[PDB]
């Protein structure tokens, strides 16, 4: 009778959860969000149904992910703790929002997810549920005392026992998340921050060492801070559709060893965690975007935006995408992107993304009025305050 | 009778100014600051004396530049407008401060400088003078109406040098010190002009750099670099000046540290610059990586929020200001126990942290039930916003 | 003929400038901005013509001042250096903007002002001119070496020679600026910050000592952070028009001794200055508005807004009203005011403005979501990080 | 065998908790903090022993409350959400710190408190325990499922007290210490309910206060109050406790320090409170006035930008956190040479600075030509912006 919409990935955790909820008497709808992971969605839907789902939704969210999520983060050049481009964090609110909309469509009273009881993704799901429809009841088995006792090999044994299909070959020994923006790799041997990742940790980018010994020049065009065109100046390739252009940046980046990050981050739930991230396309876009801002944005606007950029990234990381405070910052950050319009040429070569030229119709260089006397005054007035401080303390 | 301490580079501008002040009857002390530029300081001393200087100070300020200036910027991972590592801005307060101290030593009543009338460096000189000894009178010929009347162009400077018997390459304006070389103006002034490889003079291009990675272990204590070890060839540096120069060599040989950007000026509006900062690029990246494993999250968030302001103060010339003192109090506090070592892979322009260790981390206490409460309290506020709006 | 639009106040400085610009061969348009000063604008316009002006614009800007300037500052509860409600600073950009618009209507090539060469108002004028129309040339006689040399008693002597009328009685011995929002008093004896102002410094508010020993209760209603009604709960007066409502708050405040401030502020041009300010109506509105925000605004939004509110006030003080950075902040600050809608009851008594009640349809109080187990988890997760800091500061510190 | 140091108030909840812990077999040490509340501490100590505590510590923390907590908040003119002077929040870390110190002294392995399970004080206790000694085990009966099952309501507490021989007014929840008294809940819970004058118990109303102003001169050194002088009656205090109590007396007599607001909670959402903070209201106003003549503009601007965060840390219970240490380093630096005296007029609720003086000011060098350059350089950037907003906007 009772319906639950379960965020279903096809992996062992959500497959066990799906069976388990069916066994508890729920009508389970499996919701499969395609945000660019290189998964077999046909197989995943079959697995859900064989596991007991009444109905499967396979939702192609890739274009929306790009235009309304990745490009929104781009407004702040969002980087968490100086470094992390937030690939998992940017996807989760989109995935949860769509889950909310499906539950409303189905008249389901419950949403469920299989995020772990001790990570960040659980927060990103649940804060979104709360922000969009607080009337939906939330099921999180990894925080359920009963589930937690049963599954402290317990998951595989239960799959075998209950007729849940299981993977026909060994899983990679890392916890990995993948979407159109990045692949993350955590846990296993990576848990020790003094352990150097071996090359097999990486699955998208080639290493800078293996990347071709030849430069590629791209021109990336923006309008009010949004990418609108990528042109390969070597081979002539041109992309204008936002999804295709972003995918093309991923391709160029990955081929050329761009976008690897190895860091220890502070979690929202927990203390610290070591992650290895591969972000080929967004790495390129963020660098190009900042370069155009250099020639277009007012100095004082940039300074204030940069002051607030850590907060913007924190809100994304923590799961407050759909929060009043995010709306406050976005109002200003969007205003700052007005007339961030023009084109940047980037040289791409063995891991390096180097702006070499840029142009904007909205700059002084579209083909000042002071003198040395003005400088003298400007200095003298600023200096006054410093003299006073000295003549006292 | 009246003494002036002139910041003397040996170039045309300051040699002219030396003579000019001497002609006005000042006793000029020439102050020559060695901050790592490639100059013949012996020659410059001799020229100063021959031009009129009663005395010459040649000050080797390299070690102080590293320990008290570059390592101070490092406290905030200082980067102006996202990108710029401030090589010109970090040196100038040091040079100006030593100038003030000499004037105090000599009982000189004036300090003078030859920076230009529409750039940033004049501000960095004069704000340091003001902050450290407001009693000193400041001479700035390039903002002096009489000087500007007389020296309308380079030919005027050159002719005067010939008349007065003053002794005596690239189409870019360039500043060089231990931390960086900058290249601006000329063809670079157009931000749509791609710099020729010939613009770069310190770092090899990534394209020409060795096809084998270098691995360095960089050790820090309270945010201060204390050791560099080359993991493949065994080189170890512990002296701060030697370790910094070694980072410069490893970066330059491997194509690290190039930046091409347009920055907002303090005096003026926007300028396109090309900068080569090999060693500090490495250091800043290594430092941020160690902070990842050592710093409290909330400290880091606040520090990062304030880091643009910290960089702005450095850029604008407010090194010796009350507001810089305020920020440094906090930023130094944040660096307590930023202690450990980082392994970085250096390869054709890339500087990649691959491993790190600190004795002051939990790599040297809750359950899932707790997460449920943490989430629910946080979510409350969001549910209200929805129910009401 | 060269046409200049001069910001003309009718006082000694601008009358001399008017004359002088006539004597230098300009066609001068005198622009007189009525922003609520209690001046005889008929006499000012005549003085302008007697002094040589070709034409006079007397512009009633009071309503616009309230709705587009005072109410804009209110969005941030703007207070400069914790205290100053910015009455002079909020008026100058409106005055300068209208001046630019009159120069453009008239095809004047120049705008001019008489603000002093060493104060803040000059900046507020000239940054507005630059922001709105950089093609206009700016005349500032108090920064003009010639004008400056002549007028180091020298102004009064020149007025006499040129037939310029001068004031028929002694001026109050303070520098005073007045508009609908405040009266300011500086200089003279107030220059010494250890000098206690005597009661004759004050010219709008009664002192709290002199105010009636009787409370007044007002209800102030807001919609999206904008005042939309004032009701006197004792005597029934009601006002909804923004100008009338603001004037009424001025009246109630002044009668009840509200809005006096004595402080030393840091100038933008210069160092420090001691000022005495009387801001009766806005003092009330600012207090009421913050009280309503208590029941309506999200906590994290309020926190961010309050972090940025010093910058917002700085921008107003310094003259950057029409700057890109102000537009950036205002986008966020306006967003924070959505649904700041409701009513606040304030008790007004001998200088005190005390919120006693408030209501909003957009709040949880418009006529259970966690338990002690939730608290435990929330505390435990927050405590984790602190436990690590302790087991780090405890040990040997190298 | 195992020792617990319980923060003991003498009220019903902590008396029940003392007995309950004793019955579970703990050796309970009762810690009684005197932070200025008007309690009979002699009676409380006797009750604790009567109820089963093995030892009682009655700690007079009033002077330390002033010098190390109230004066620390003063460094940032701390005001939460524009208005709240943090009376409850400032006292709790002190109380908790001394509790940890007693536990350390007694070799106790547990600390306990009786703060409620859905309030803010429990956080202030427990974050302080975590920050100062994470080895201590924490007992919080109001978040313990067993205690909560047993004591579903006040009647259960009362019956247990009777049953176990535990010895033993206003329709508001009230917190009282040297800095303030707070009043919440009951009828005040409705923010549209105007508080009756009877809600107020410390300060007289402005309406009832004397119709004559009092003039005080308050002297500071490096942001710390060092002297108060009454200019009309000659009273003078320099000791920090005496001076603060004197400000409380003058404020309360003259109707100063009342606040009625809705604040956002840390645990929970919004709450309406009425607060009476006579002395500190005076001190905060005086302090800000002195800063006007002493502090550098840019320091003041940065400090004020950070002041909301400073107040948040205090409210939330992060007094002993690394991020607080970070801010304190800077905020203390800002107070160097905040030294001088301020004269305030106090009259029927008003605290008005009327004069001030510092030896560290120009009250103890540019020209008009300079203004022209300063303005022109600043204007450049605005002229560029205009020549780009006037364009076709794509």
From Swiss-Prot, chain B:
Main location: cytoplasm
GO molecular function: argininosuccinate synthase activity; ATP binding
Pathway linked to the protein: Amino-acid biosynthesis; L-arginine biosynthesis; L-arginine from L-ornithine and carbamoyl phosphate: step 2/3
Positions that bind L-citrulline: 84, 120, 124, 173, 182, 263, 275
GO CC annotation: cytoplasm
Catalytic activity: L-citrulline + L-aspartate + ATP = 2-(N(omega)-L-arginino)succinate + AMP + diphosphate + H(+)
HAMAP family: Arg_succ_synth_type1
Protein name per the record: Argininosuccinate synthase
Protein's gene: argG
